[PDB]
Paper text:
Among structural proteins of Sarbecoviruses, spike (S) protein is responsible for receptor binding and mediates membrane fusion between cell and virus to initiate infection. RBDs in SARS-CoV-1 spikes were observed to be in the “up” and “down” positions making the spikes exhibit open and closed conformations, respectively. We introduced these three disulfide bonds in equivalent positions in the SARS-CoV-1 S sequence generating three spike variants: S/x1 (S370C and D967C), S/x2 (G400C and V969C), and S/x3 (D414C and V969C). We determined cryo-EM structures of SARS-CoV-1 S/x1, S/x2, and S/x3 spikes and we identified various previously undetected conformations for SARS-CoV-1 S through classification procedures.
Previously, we and others found that low pH was able to convert a closed/open SARS-CoV-2 spike to locked conformations. Previously, only closed and open conformations were observed for purified SARS-CoV-1 S. We have attempted to convert native SARS-CoV-1 S ectodomain (S/native) without engineered disulfide to locked conformation by prolonged incubation under low pH (pH 5.5 for 24 h); however, we only observed open and closed spikes after incubation. In line with previously determined SARS-CoV-1 S structures, Domain D-loops in closed and open spike structures determined under low pH are ordered, adopting “Domain D-loop conformation-2,” showing almost identical conformations as previously detailed for the closed conformation. We speculate that unlike SARS-CoV-2 S, where Domain D-loops are disordered in closed and open conformations, breaking interactions involving the ordered Domain D-loops in closed and open conformations represents a barrier to revert closed/open spike to locked conformations for SARS-CoV-1 S. This difference reflects how changes in Domain D may affect the dynamics of Sarbecovirus spikes.
Author numbering:
A (entry chain B): 31 to 70, 78 to 93, 96 to 132, 155 to 166, 180 to 203, 208 to 235, 250 to 425, 439 to 455, ...
B (entry chain C): 751 to 810, 818 to 823, 832 to 1045
C (entry chain A): 554 to 602
D (entry chain A): 948 to 996
E (entry chain C): 258 to 306
The structure:
């Protein structure tokens, strides 16, 4: 029968205490939700490991073996009454040879048997209760140094289950104590890979890049030329007469099948040293043709025959180039004396040893001397592994349209890549292309909302991806994953798992080139074309105008970052630690650490300057009034309350609870860590920033706009709001007559902001992003200390205690180089991010000066509307501006005229427009409907009535 | 992060209107000819005529697609979130809302007003009475139309007024060319080809040669990313200024000296270009 | 720990669990009013008790 | 330019005058790597400033 | 003589044109910018000793 092993068979990976960490390891684990076999006694295979579980005592041991006869060793583990006995003898299934023996002195028993490097690891757990579904962790019992192959096993007596371990990656979760409580299998879904990549169990909403995909080759193409004759190395080596070193000869070897293995499989040769190749690799390479130089030389002059030597033979008799490819052979068995000048390479002038030098032409022409390899057929339009005369690779092969002149064998590109080649047999030109590759994105609506995902395979045609998935030939090969019937082609790549709708909405998750994704209606992941905005029609007419008849008060919010976290590092503690050889080895690099300390310290000083620039803009500390009701406008939620312990106001408390935050070494009683990292405190505390913003709000509500330029001047609040209504282009009666409505709208809008901040909607995402980026930079820096950069260990103390100093020098050099590079990367990225934060703080200072201390006429600078007044509130690492604006609401259509004509003179309006009431002609202001009688006090006269295009006849009162 | 920031820049400059106003049937408002800055219904494309000139002006390997090919060096170019048609739809709705509602849709809802009265209000806002418009309306319409024609003819003349967008194109291409050309150096190894090293040498010395090539190529990629971060900062500052100009000069009338042209500002119009915006 | 640092140990004689911490380190700043005004300083030892 | 980055001297003329070429290649490689890194750091920080 | 050339290859694959990079200042400029037609301006090419 068949069952399923859901989240079973997790064991401790090693013997190290860990707590409150997520640990991510690679070993032989039993995958989640894999198949098991239920036996309700076959010789079962033992491929790489098993998970044996037994639900009832019918099971008391096992027999692990190779052939299960008396022809090979076989370990037997069994449990008598109060004894566990292990023996490893040849058995009939009494003991012929043996070397190991060990005697020592419903509910579910779980075991894992793993065998590697001659050791049989055994793990064991227990749990009291078909196989139940759940999580249980297995502790090690004993490993045994018994060196036998185990390919079969059998139980000893039935209800037991058998799984199979495979090499996977798990992300284990450690408790507050040391116990493992949870794990994810990083090859079960796209989502499990996404959880392992961001190192968390809870995923937000969005699109994330996790890995890259490949298409793996299915085939193998070998092409070699038509050569059959065996190669005459007999006439060159086993020869009777050789010339002297001053008259060496050269023999050309071409059109043969060289073997080269009749040379290094014998001890016949005294020296065999090869430059540019190695001897074992010569049976696959192949060459144009080979030249052999045969001559006789003395005993202690064979050393002198090498690239770059001096003497008599290496200067007057025989010289090799510096770029020599080929090699020399001498075995045990006359020259120039005077010459004007030295020789040029491979040129001659016209106890004993016997020497032959072979020089290879490497493929500047057709190959002829090729080694003994077989040739297959062409496999076109398919990802294969090719081998054309020793030129290996991986890619696809297509017919090509290039015109090779008959001395060219292959083509090139600007990055030294071969992309076309001539077949050695049929002489047709083939193109070479890569197999498909690119990135993989995972689109998720949040793990709070669902556990479905969609996958984008970036920049690929995905008939290819569907074909490679269904044939199981894609490298990120997720086990429990199906393509489905939803495959959709985009310019971004293609989207597997999202369905195409035809209704357009605003963009939620941007996929690319017009396409978005969202989570709609039971629910599913859809994919649409984004709609750019709501639709309207506004009707142009040449004699109508629309004028507002009411207004509304709106308070909106703007969030600006001002500063970030100040950081210092100790180089000698980060790079070296407590060591004293590392310090001396690091002194050889100049002042890298004085330079780094200056860079980080200047960044920190700049952060303090940012905050002083934004907030310290007043010169006098105005006290908050005891009464916070100014003509109907309730200022209670933006000024501090005398009967609370803290200085922050209500909205500031909401903002500080809104942003949610270490363990690096900052002082908070305080500790410090082995990595050498610190966070330094700011010059201005939260209490002094809140005192600043309270003084600014108090001065606005009392003095107005006058304290920002000169001295503060008191003024009642309703007159201040009347002057601001003038400043946007409305007269003062519009406030003085409708004052109660304006006060009510102000109060209701303040209450709406407070309720929308309590609603826990994320509008403070900018300050959160500042926090998140700083933390991930420091996490990368600390995690870079676990790498070894080629050394034998990442720990300096193990290197220093396990090795002499002359090898510890080179291992500490590799570690020093890698760590200096990691620290330099951190400092460069901090400087670029500091520039960005300083631009944002410069803008926040301009907005405090022009929108809080004044009234700005710039469109959309502070708010969306006509600006009235603004309020600063302090946030963690930033400022929040609450802009009060003026919005006009209900419209009406009128008939309008540019000028009117009375007695032969044209009258124009001073400040306003002429409108038609429906009964008569009035004059009104543009931003509110208040009609007035047309008189000579609000008109002016210029010219006669024969030139304005659209003039009318009406009377003008006197 | 650089890739996401580019799309944020484009959304910040162009998506500044709530509602999509349809281009009017008639493009003649009191004598002012708007035919060259609004799209024509008798053509297959959404771009206007001046936008067509601008797109023909700039003269724009690695994998990318639109058939989908790849290169051995592992380099692609990703497509943007907003197509050229959507940016053209944005700038068309901005021109239409200006020519019909004037300045009132940057603060609330749009309110229609005849174009001559809108121009009289703008003349009043620079400090000139409205009768100066209403009595010399024909001359001002003629000067507007002649200036639009000279803008058209000076862009057809093939003068390099669009040097900034070309500079953007050139800097990006030469960065990627240097990155591909760095794959020919060997950095001390016997050859710059990994397959030659792996096919003609044993394991123990191939480790040394491959370590040298790995070190050099990591250094080349690090230089590319650091310089891309600095250039992204430049492009973000420039896009922030362009969003400030679209707010304060297209949706209003600015009193700031030399912010929006040289003179006394009346009104301004946006057109789309490759990787940019052109303000008239 | 996460940077391969051993921060606890079991005593091989009494089987008591011990904690390992670095002993104090940090930076040293020198506060001066100018050498032409005086020749006395103050020293800040950063981030320790 | 006064640092030697592991080589026997910070001077190329001393290395080239008192040593054969087969070891001078190693010492000059160490100096070349150190100086390339110094000049790269200068150019990066000039761009930011 | 040992010189440096910049060779132009056709679309078919034949050499059609070349510049001798040590004949003029302009030929050195063409080889350093890797093109045949230069724009207007001032360009840095090499260093003198
Ligand atoms: C014990 O092992 C040896 C070789 O290891 C073998 O020759 C011998 O036959 C074995 N003993 C018996 C009784 O077979
Ligand atoms: C060739 O001839 C010239 C003059 O006879 C001589 O100097 C030179 O050394 C000879 N050999 C070579 C290898 O050039
Ligand atoms: C090589 O041999 C093949 C047979 O395998 C033959 O078809 C082909 O024509 C030969 N080509 C040459 C160039 O000898
Ligand atoms: C303006 O709107 C308010 C409610 O927002 C209403 O009470 C008032 O009557 C309106 N004014 C007019 C003239 O309709
Ligand atoms: C001002 O607002 C606060 C907050 O709701 C409220 O408790 C207080 O009573 C108000 N003051 C009045 C109505 O005078
Ligand atoms: C015209 O104005 C009068 C007052 O002068 C007003 O009673 C009447 O309602 C107005 N006409 C219309 C159509 O509203
Ligand atoms: C507006 O300009 C276009 C382009 O020059 C022209 O064809 C059209 O006739 C003009 N409209 C008029 C004159 O009404
Ligand atoms: C390339 O070869 C073709 C012949 O197929 C010839 O017509 C053409 O002139 C050649 N040259 C170029 C530049 O295409």
């Amino acid at each position: 029968t068949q069952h399923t092993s859901s989240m079973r068979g997790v064991y401790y990976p090693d013997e190290i205490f860990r707590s409150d960490t997520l640990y991510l390891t690679q070993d032989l684990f039993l995958p989640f939700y894999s198949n098991v076999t239920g036996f309700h006694n076959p010789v079962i295979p033992f491929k790489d490991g098993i998970y044996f579980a037994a639900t009832e005592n019918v099971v008391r041991g096992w027999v692990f073996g190779s052939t299960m006869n008396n022809k090979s060793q076989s370990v037997i583990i069994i449990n008598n009454s109060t004894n566990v006995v292990i023996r490893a003898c040849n058995f009939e299934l009494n003991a012929f040879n043996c070397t190991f023996e060990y005697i020592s002195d419903k509910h579910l028993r779980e075991f894992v048997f793993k065998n590697k490097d001659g050791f049989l690891y055994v793990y064991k757990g227990y749990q009291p209760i078909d196989l139940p579904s759940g999580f249980n962790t297995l502790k090690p019992i004993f490993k045994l140094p018994l060196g036998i192959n185990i390919t079969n096993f059998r139980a000893i007596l039935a209800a037991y289950f058998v799984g199979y371990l495979k090499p996977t990656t798990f992300m284990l979760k450690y408790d507050e104590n040391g116990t493992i409580t949870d794990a994810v299998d990083c090859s079960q879904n796209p989502l499990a890979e996404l959880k392992c990549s961001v190192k968390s169990f809870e995923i937000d909403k969005g699109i994330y890049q996790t890995s890259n995909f490949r298409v793996v080759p299915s085939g193998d193409v070998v092409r070699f030329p038509n050569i059959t004759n065996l190669c005459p190395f007999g006439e060159v080596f086993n020869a009777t007469k050789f010339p002297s070193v001053y008259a060496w000869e050269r023999k050309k070897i071409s059109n043969c099948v060289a073997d080269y293995s009749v040379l290094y499989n014998s001890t016949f040769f005294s020296t065999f040293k090869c430059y540019g190749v190695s001897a074992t690799k010569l049976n696959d390479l192949c060459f144009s043709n080979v030249y052999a130089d045969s001559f006789v030389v003395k005993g202690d002059d064979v050393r002198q025959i090498a690239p770059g030597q001096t003497g008599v033979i290496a200067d007057y008799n025989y010289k090799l180039p510096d770029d020599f490819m080929g090699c020399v052979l001498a075995w045990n068995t006359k020259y120039r004396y005077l010459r004007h000048g030295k020789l040029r390479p491979f040129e001659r002038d016209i106890q004993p040893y016997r020497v032959v030098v072979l020089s290879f032409e490497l493929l500047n022409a057709p190959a002829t001397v090729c080694g003994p390899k077989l040739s297959t057929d062409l496999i076109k339009n398919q990802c294969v592994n090719f081998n054309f005369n020793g030129l290996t690779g991986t890619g696809v092969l297509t017919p090509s349209s290039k015109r090779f002149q008959p001395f060219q064998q292959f083509g090139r590109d600007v990055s030294d890549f071969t992309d076309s080649v001539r077949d050695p047999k049929t002489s047709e030109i083939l193109d070479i292309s890569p197999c498909s590759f690119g990135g993989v994105s995972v689109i998720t609506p949040g793990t709070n909302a669902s556990s479905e995902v969609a996958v984008l395979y970036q920049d690929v045609n995905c008939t290819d991806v569907s074909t490679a998935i269904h044939a199981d030939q894609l490298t990120p090969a997720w086990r429990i994953y199906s393509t489905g019937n939803n495959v959709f082609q985009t310019q971004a790549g293609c989207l597997i798992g999202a369905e195409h709708v035809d209704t357009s909405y605003e963009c939620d998750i941007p996929i690319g080139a017009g396409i978005c994704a969202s989570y709609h209606t039971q629910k599913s992941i859809v994919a649409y074309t984004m709609s750019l905005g709501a639709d309207s029609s506004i009707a142009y007419s040449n004699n109508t105008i629309a004028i507002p008849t009411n207004f509304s008060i709106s308070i909106t919010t703007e969030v600006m970052p001002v500063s970030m976290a100040k950081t210092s590092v100790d180089c000698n503690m980060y790079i070296c630690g407590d060591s004293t050889e590392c310090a001396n080895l690091l002194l050889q690099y100049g002042s890298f650490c004085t330079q780094l300390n200056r860079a980080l310290s200047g960044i920190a000083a700049e952060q303090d300057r940012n905050t002083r620039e934004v907030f310290a803009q007043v010169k006098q500390m105005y006290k908050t009034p005891t009464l916070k009701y100014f003509g109907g406008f309730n200022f209670s939620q933006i000024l501090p309350d005398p009967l609370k312990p803290t200085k922050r106001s209500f909205i500031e408390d909401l903002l500080f609870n809104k942003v949610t935050l270490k363990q690096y070494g900052e002082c908070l009683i305080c500790a410090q860590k082995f990595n050498g990292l610190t966070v330094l405190p700011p010059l201005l505390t939260d209490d002094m920033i809140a005192a600043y913003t309270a003084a600014l709000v108090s001065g606005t509500a009392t003095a107005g706009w006058t304290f920002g330029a000169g001295a503060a001047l008191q003024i009642p609040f309703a007159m201040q709001m009347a002057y601001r209504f003038n400043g946007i282009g409305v007269t003062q009666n519009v406030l003085y007559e409708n004052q109660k409505q304006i006060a009510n709208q102000f109060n209701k809008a303040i209450s709406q902001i407070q309720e929308s901040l309590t609603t826990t909607s994320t509008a403070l995402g900018k300050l959160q992003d500042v926090v998140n980026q700083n933390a991930q930079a420091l996490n990368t820096l600390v995690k870079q200390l676990s790498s070894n950069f080629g050394a034998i260990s990442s720990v300096l103390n193990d290197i220093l205690s396990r090795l002499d100093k002359v090898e510890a020098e080179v291992q500490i050099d590799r570690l020093i180089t890698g760590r200096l590079q990691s620290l330099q990367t951190y400092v460069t990225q901090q400087l670029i991010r500091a520039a960005e934060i300083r631009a944002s703080a410069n803008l926040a200072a301009t907005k405090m000066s022009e929108c809080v201390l004044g009234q700005s006429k710039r469109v959309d600078f502070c708010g969306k509307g006509y600006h009235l007044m603004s309020f600063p509130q302090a946030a963690p690492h930033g400022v929040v501006f609450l802009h009060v604006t003026y919005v006009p609401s209900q419209e009406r259509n009128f008939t309008t005229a540019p000028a009117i004509c009375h007695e032969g003179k044209a009258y124009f309006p001073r400040e306003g427009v002429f409108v038609f009431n429906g009964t008569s002609w009035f004059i009104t202001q543009r931003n509110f409907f208040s009609p007035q009688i047309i008189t000579t006090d609000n008109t002016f006269v210029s010219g006669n009535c024969d030139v304005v295009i659209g003039i009318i006849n009406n009377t003008v009162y006197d």
